[PDB]
């Protein structure tokens, strides 16, 4: 419902232009894996993460040039994660799907290690890598995918269900925001506590509002554990949590707050 | 045949003690993935890589404390790579094997990002990450696993077969050596050209001497493309290439040269 349905289109372009220069570097293009990578990566999605990197950094004074690195990096992790998700093993040139996943995770760090950064950003390059590894491994995206493992058969605690989305979706999204901030150096870093709160609320609400769109277009789902109206009340409460968090930030929180609303107001 | 059969035992211990402190950090231990990780990682092998990190650094003045970071990091990549290798998809709680691979690659970078380093090492932390990503992705271990893909059915060019081992085994092994060197800062870095030559020769010869041990204990194999004696001549030539490379290095090349001999003299 917001002007974020078509803003995400402005960036979405840069992110693809950028991720291309990176794929272009790889030798043996005629090779297939470098192909799966190229598809599995330039297909993607709405690129909410890259977008979060961009707007968060800008809000903090960064040029887009100062942000293509984290932006591109974070999308590589996202992309890898989907590819692995769609595996016969998991869901029930496959081996090529496995490899292409593996190579995209690696690519993400190549990017964080090698890409340009403002002088302010440089000071945080190591911090960007620790944050991307932390959000992606057994302490985030992986720990959360491990939890959606056991949960697949059973129906679960609302807590459990949140702890799942928190790690499996929250971590990387909070990461895209942290990256965006770190690109602006210590000034950005000092804003993390508030940005974190924001991220956690927005990451969770994103899931809740899916389920709500699942039910409203005709397991353990937010609507099942709370009922349709009980869930919508949760999403709205989370949008309030986000916005409340952004109020602590002394900068133009316009596009972030706006992104929060889009998460829950979407007809997507 | 060398005293490197039981030296690799001295370190092999540290590497496991060290990789433990890292696994210990992860929350939700009772969880399974944090288990697969713990097995798939503390099983492992001879740990030639961690060893290469250690001896190379020492040769350059580093304390072992200054080296546990690269040492531990590099083993995480190795370990992940095996786990993925043994997949139904590839070879022909599986999904748990997939995840455990993914989480170990991530863990490797967590380690490089977070672990202690001498002040000399710190200066190269970003360079250690780029070298580990470069050696592990579509420009190394992955590009080389992609090549052993197409080669599985057909019989191939000696070149092709080397280009496969070069990327699929050479890259990471040359990486363990580069890491060891970088731990000693710019002094170590300046030695890379020679260490690289050494690494490439030793990485390749390691493969050739496998095949030779395969045939001598009773597809496209070194022995098939060159014959038993033709291969042994190649391994010996590579040991000469390595040793010739170490001669350019103004430091105690004893343990490296010694490791080269072990590669080709092994009854393993």
From TrEMBL, chains A, B:
What GO terms fall under cellular component here? cytoplasm
Needed co-factor(s):
Mg(2+)
GO MF, any single term: metal ion binding
Q: Which GO terms describe its biological process?
A: phospholipid biosynthetic process; terpenoid biosynthetic process
Q: Which residues fall in a coiled-coil region?
A: none
* Annotated Pfam families: polyprenyl_synt (PF00348)
Record keywords, A-Z: Isoprene biosynthesis, Magnesium, Metal-binding, Transferase
Q: Does this UniProt record's set of keywords contain Metal-binding?
A: yes
What the entry lists under NCBIfam families is as follows: FPPsyn, PRK10581.1
Name of the protein this chain belongs to? Geranyltranstransferase
> Which lineage is the organism of this entry classified under, starting from the top rank?
Bacteria, Pseudomonadati, Pseudomonadota, Gammaproteobacteria, Vibrionales
């Amino acid at each position: 419902h917001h002007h974020s349905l078509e803003a995400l289109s402005s960036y979405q372009q840069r992110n693809n232009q950028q991720l291309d220069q990176w794929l272009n570097r790889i030798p043996f293009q005629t090779l297939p894996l470098i192909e799966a990578m190229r598809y599995g990566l330039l297909l993607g999605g709405k690129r909410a993460r890259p977008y979060l990197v961009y707007i968060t950094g800008q809000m903090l004074g960064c040029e887009l040039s100062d942000l293509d690195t984290p932006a591109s990096a974070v999308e590589c992790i996202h992309a890898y994660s989907l590819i692995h998700d769609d595996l016969p093993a998991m869901d029930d040139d496959e081996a090529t799907a496995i490899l292409t996943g593996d190579a995209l995770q690696t690519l993400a760090f190549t990017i964080l290690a090698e890409g340009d950064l403002s002088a302010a950003g440089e000071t945080q390059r190591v911090a960007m890598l620790q944050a991307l590894a932390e959000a992606s491994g057994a302490q985030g995206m992986c720990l959360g995918q491990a939890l959606d493992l056991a949960a697949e058969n059973r129906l679960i605690s609302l807590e459990e269900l949140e702890t799942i989305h928190r790690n499996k979706t929250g971590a990387l999204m909070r990461c895209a925001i942290r990256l965006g901030a770190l690109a602006a150096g210590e000034k950005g870093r000092a804003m993390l506590p508030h940005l974190d709160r924001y991220a956690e609320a927005v990451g969770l609400a994103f899931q809740v509002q899916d389920d709500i769109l699942d039910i409203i277009s005709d397991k353990s789902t937010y609507p099942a554990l709370l009922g349709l109206e009980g869930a919508q009340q949760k999403a709205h409460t989370l949008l309030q949590e986000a916005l409340l968090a952004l109020e602590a930030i002394p900068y133009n929180t316009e596009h972030l707050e706006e992104f929060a609303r889009y998460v829950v107001e979407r007809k997507n």
